[PDB]
């Protein structure tokens, strides 16, 4: 299990203050959202199990990512100075930090990765004692965060407060935070060729694997695989298709690999 | 549970 905090800080050249869309993703489920353009200017709950948290917690979180919003404003200014970019550009600071836990709730591995304008600006390694870098601006951020040992404080957060809140959400979300349908639909394409689409629905998390195996041989040719598309209510969707000649429907099957499946189902329509 | 720490770039 893991808790991801994705931060987006797209600046606006004179259209107002930088947008600070910030979200919380414990496992593959969003539970808290912060929108700098939202009317409430508050921590809108995004999960049925986080609406039970106390108003003190909500005030703490909303003050915290208001502070993070102004932090991203200042960081945008500093980076625009670093990259020597003009203020007329809509620059983005996208920040993700998070912490991994085992089934026992014990901390496994912490994440803190930063990206400016798409490129991976700076990230926290697996040790959680030092940072990575990509360019000279990332070198300046490296020097600043190693002079004040920002890595130590970030690691403290990740293996302290991060995992504490994560496991608290676990007791909050036993029924939700912790099974693809696999319809195996077919649609004719041509008298000599056809495509088979096995329709996996409502599986959580998104670590699905579809391979389109034929009882021993691996196929990646003509097996186009779409990205892990969520359905909207926290689950995800996945499917794949194979270009095959018509009339051999029984010869091709897809194998499903999901955490929620007791056994990997295989359909042979 | 959100990071109270804000390290600056």
């Amino acid at each position, epitope marked *: 299990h893991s808790m991801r905090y994705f931060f987006t800080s797209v600046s606006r050249p004179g259209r107002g203050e930088p947008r600070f869309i910030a979200v919380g993703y414990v496992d593959d489920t969003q539970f808290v959202r912060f929108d700098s353009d939202a009317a409430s200017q508050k921590m809108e709950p995004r999960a049925p199990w986080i609406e039970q948290e106390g108003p*003190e917690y909500w*005030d*703490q979180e909303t*003050r*915290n990512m*208001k*502070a993070h919003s*102004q*932090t991203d404003r*200042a960081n945008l200014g500093t980076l625009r100075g670093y990259y020597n970019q003009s203020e007329d550009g809509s620059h983005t600071i996208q920040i993700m930090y998070g912490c991994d836990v085992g089934p026992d709730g014990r901390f496994l591995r912490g994440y803190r990765q930063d990206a400016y304008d798409g490129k991976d600006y700076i990230a926290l390694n697996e040790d959680l004692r030092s940072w990575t870098a990509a360019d000279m601006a990332a070198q300046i951020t490296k020097r600043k965060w190693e002079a*004040v*040992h*920002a890595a*130590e*404080q970030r*690691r*403290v*957060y990740l293996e*302290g*407060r991060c995992v*504490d809140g994560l496991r608290r959400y676990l007791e909050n979300g036993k029924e939700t935070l912790q099974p693809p349908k696999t319809h195996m639909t077919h649609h004719p394409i041509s008298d000599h060729e056809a495509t088979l689409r096995c329709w996996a629905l409502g599986f959580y998390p998104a670590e699905i694997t579809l391979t389109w195996q034929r009882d021993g041989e691996d196929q990646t040719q003509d097996t186009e695989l779409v990205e892990t598309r969520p359905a909207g209510d926290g689950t995800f969707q996945k499917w794949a298709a194979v270009v095959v000649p018509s009339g051999e429907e029984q010869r091709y099957t897809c194998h499903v690999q999901h955490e929620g499946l007791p056994k990997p189902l295989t359909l042979r329509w | *549970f959100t*990071s*109270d*720490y*804000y*390290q*600056l770039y």
Partner: T-cell receptor, first 113, second 110 residues
């Protein structure tokens, strides 16, 4: 390097009493502290960019504000005898955890009868 | 909530002003304030969770190489060392910014 005024204001009970703090140049977070000898450093309220981010356990009569230049002022209305404390300003370069909260010289308020 | 165990510690100008700052809820930083009597708490240094010890002047700071621990040591105390040494803890998750230990009134004998 925090300049804080007034130094030894002596306004009596009631009154308004405004205490001004000028944080270190570049510090955008200001924290307010009351040094009652019977309770030590008590957190009043913290200001970061014109907003009360963190507030301590004090009545509504303890109010403050922060200006555009990150300078902060506090107001202590309807004073009683228990407010004769050295009020302190803690200037953090940034709000939240992980910032060296430097301290101003203090405002030794006394609520004379 | 931090517990600075030596509420007051009257020593002589010889040595030994260990002011161990017991705490739970592992501290991101501790910081240390030397409140000169009749004065403001002067910031000494912030002990980020790098563990180890820091040797500012003749004082010896010590942040525990583990969760939720800290300390401080003047070694050779002197007259100018008199003051209420204060803990702090930003302690990610706390509504109050810095939770202070109740201080350690250090007095020395020439």
């Amino acid at each position: 390097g925090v300049t804080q005024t007034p130094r030894y204001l002596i306004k009596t009970r009631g009154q308004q009493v405004t205490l001004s703090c000028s944080p270190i140049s570049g510090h955008r977070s200001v924290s307010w502290y009351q040094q009652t000898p019977g309770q030590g450093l008590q957190f009043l309220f913290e200001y970061f960019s014109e907003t009360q981010r963190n507030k301590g356990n004090f009545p509504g009569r303890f109010s403050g504000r922060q200006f555009s230049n990150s300078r902060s002022e506090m107001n202590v209305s309807t004073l009683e005898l228990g407010d004769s404390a050295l009020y302190l300003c803690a200037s953090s370069l940034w709000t939240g955890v992980g910032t060296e909260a430097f301290f101003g010289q203090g405002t030794r308020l006394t609520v004379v009868e | 909530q931090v517990m600075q165990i030596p509420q007051y510690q009257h020593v002589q100008e010889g040595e030994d002003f260990t002011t161990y700052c017991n705490s739970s809820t592992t501290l991101s930083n501790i910081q240390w304030y030397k409140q000169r009597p009749g004065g403001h708490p002067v910031f000494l240094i912030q002990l980020v969770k790098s563990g180890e010890v820091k040797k500012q002047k003749r004082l010896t700071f010590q942040f525990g190489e583990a969760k939720k621990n800290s300390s401080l040591h003047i070694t050779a105390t002197q007259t100018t060392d008199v003051g209420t040494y204060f803990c702090a803890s930003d302690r990610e998750g706390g509504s109050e910014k810095l939770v202070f230990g109740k201080g350690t009134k250090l007095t020395v004998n020439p």
